[PDB]
């Protein structure tokens, strides 16, 4: 039940999503090992993901969380990079999309920095890079990221050493 609608680059919605992507690039402590060496992206396409069943699943949970947290869902827009992007857009996020060995336990991870999520597009630590050239810093191959609506509710704050 998922359809993808292309946004025009003239659409204000395309432009605000592109700005969030570009403006949250940073340098990484691995010198580019996982995600590649870059300061900006070439955005090729932005598509809206439309699935009524998955949206209703989200809003059902959002209301449950809101009611447990003084009517505050604490909703954010965050990036997610994954080799499972095709499964996610068709079937939703679930346990198969969790980072089992993550710093904060086995859950589904999201980032404010688009470049952080870019490190996971080809797998944990960038895996072996792009399927065609085996290059984690491939400048040719097309990559995909999700920009996701995420309900945080009451969030446990972990300081990172």
């Amino acid at each position: 039940g998922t359809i993808l609608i292309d946004l025009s680059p003239d659409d204000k919605e395309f432009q605000s999503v592109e700005e969030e992507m570009q403006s949250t690039v940073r340098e990484h402590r691995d010198g580019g090992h996982a995600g590649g060496i870059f300061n900006r992206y070439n955005i090729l396409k932005i598509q809206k993901v439309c699935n009524k069943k998955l949206w209703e699943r989200y809003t059902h949970r959002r209301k449950e969380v809101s009611e447990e947290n003084h009517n505050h869902a604490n909703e954010r827009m965050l990036f997610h990079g994954s080799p499972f992007v095709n499964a996610i857009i068709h079937k939703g996020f679930d346990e198969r999309h969790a980072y089992i060995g993550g710093m904060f336990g086995a859950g589904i991870y999201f980032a404010e920095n688009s470049s952080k999520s870019n490190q996971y597009v080809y797998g944990i630590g960038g895996g072996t890079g792009c399927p065609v050239h085996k290059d984690r810093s491939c400048y040719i191959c097309h990559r995909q990221l999700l920009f996701c609506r995420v309900t945080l509710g009451k969030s446990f704050l972990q300081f990172s050493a």
Partner: protein
């Protein structure tokens, strides 16, 4: 998947060394995220 800490719905990883890093977040229920936008892109080689 793990459970959220008791009385919490997510975890926020706040950076405490790298002053330029933004936060990262973890949820433990797939129903707490919806994939709104699919962005297709290339990384650009620095000049």
């Amino acid at each position: 998947m793990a459970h959220s800490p008791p009385g919490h719905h997510s975890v926020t990883g706040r950076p405490s060394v790298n002053g330029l890093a933004l936060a990262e977040y973890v949820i433990y229920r797939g129903e707490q995220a919806y994939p709104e936008y699919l962005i297709t892109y290339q990384i650009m080689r620095p000049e």
